[PDB]
Amino acid sequence: NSNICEVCNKWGRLFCCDTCPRSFHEHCHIPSVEANKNPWSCIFCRIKTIQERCPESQSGHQESEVLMRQMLPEEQLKCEFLLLKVYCDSKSCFFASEPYYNREGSQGPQKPMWLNKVKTSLNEQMYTRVEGFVQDMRLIFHNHKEFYREDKFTRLGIQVQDIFEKNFRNIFAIQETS
Ligand SMILES: [Zn+2]
Ligand SMILES: [Zn+2]
Ligand SMILES: [Zn+2]
């Protein structure tokens, strides 16, 4: 197995996947690495299994249809993985914890949002549809863009949103377009 966490790229107290060579810190994995379970399969393996069991799940889909799906176990898992994929980018540190807003010439957002809050919301099964999760994720970046205005720091929002969106299209097999 790997000697660093797949998500944060640091060594430490790591749990090793039994079906692939990835390793994770306990709370870097999403969901948090389970207490017992031998063997244990990580979320990358669990997502691969879903695909292999239903090859047709990779045919293209309309985003509108994906968003209206109820958060049954497989959609819950796919959102957990998509959230993990954003945490895998080091620039996610900017959006992880609860932000605050005091900048001359700007006003804070009406509805602040951050990755740790989405993580808790998923853990507590607060989303009933994929739409709920996707709206919160997109809100994180939209709030950032609106607040930082013409400061070049706005680009961090664009960058992390692109990681989100690419992984969203991949995981939920959105129909490719120009
Ligand atoms: Zn880690
Ligand atoms: Zn694995
Ligand atoms: Zn089938």
Side-chain angles (χ1 to χ4, degrees), residues 1-36 38-178:
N1 287 63
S2 182
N3 303 335
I4 62 176
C5 177
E6 187 79 358
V7 181
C8 76
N9 307 101
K10 298 289 194 286
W11 180 73
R13 181 56 191 111
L14 302 172
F15 304 82
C16 285
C17 186
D18 290 315
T19 49
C20 75
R22 301 170 171 95
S23 313
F24 303 81
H25 294 103
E26 171 167 18
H27 301 304
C28 281
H29 197 269
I30 304 179
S32 292
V33 168
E34 296 72 20
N36 202 287
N38 319 57
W40 178 77
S41 272
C42 81
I43 189 162
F44 292 76
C45 286
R46 296 168 66 186
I47 291 288
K48 187 204 302 301
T49 298
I50 306 311
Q51 281 168 26
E52 290 175 345
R53 290 178 160 157
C54 289
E56 67 273 33
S57 71
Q58 305 160 273
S59 291
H61 298 81
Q62 298 298 113
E63 186 174 301
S64 59
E65 176 268 318
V66 168
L67 297 180
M68 293 307 303
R69 295 181 193 169
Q70 293 174 15
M71 288 281 256
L72 295 186
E74 290 190 347
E75 303 317 302
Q76 176 74 31
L77 194 73
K78 284 183 174 210
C79 292
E80 289 161 352
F81 188 49
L82 172 49
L83 183 54
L84 179 133
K85 286 295 195 142
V86 168
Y87 281 103
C88 288
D89 196 281
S90 65
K91 294 157 180 284
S92 71
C93 70
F94 297 111
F95 301 106
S97 76
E98 182 174 4
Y100 64 83
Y101 298 96
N102 196 355
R103 186 196 184 233
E104 185 177 329
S106 290
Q107 271 295 325
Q110 304 300 305
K111 188 180 170 185
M113 192 46 63
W114 58 101
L115 302 165
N116 298 343
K117 187 181 175 54
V118 178
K119 179 179 290 199
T120 293
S121 292
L122 272 172
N123 178 246
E124 290 179 9
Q125 301 155 309
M126 301 288 287
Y127 300 116
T128 54
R129 287 174 201 272
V130 173
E131 187 177 46
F133 164 83
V134 172
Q135 285 173 341
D136 284 354
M137 294 295 286
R138 286 173 170 167
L139 184 64
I140 294 170
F141 315 114
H142 189 253
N143 282 348
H144 178 99
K145 286 164 93 175
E146 292 312 296
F147 183 74
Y148 290 107
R149 305 290 201 97
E150 311 302 287
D151 195 300
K152 67 190 170 171
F153 191 61
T154 67
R155 183 157 170 263
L156 271 297
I158 290 167
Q159 291 172 325
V160 185
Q161 180 155 21
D162 193 44
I163 295 299
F164 174 73
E165 295 296 341
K166 286 183 194 282
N167 283 282
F168 173 68
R169 289 190 305 265
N170 181 252
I171 291 167
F172 287 92
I174 298 297
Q175 179 51 55
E176 287 277 297
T177 59
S178 49

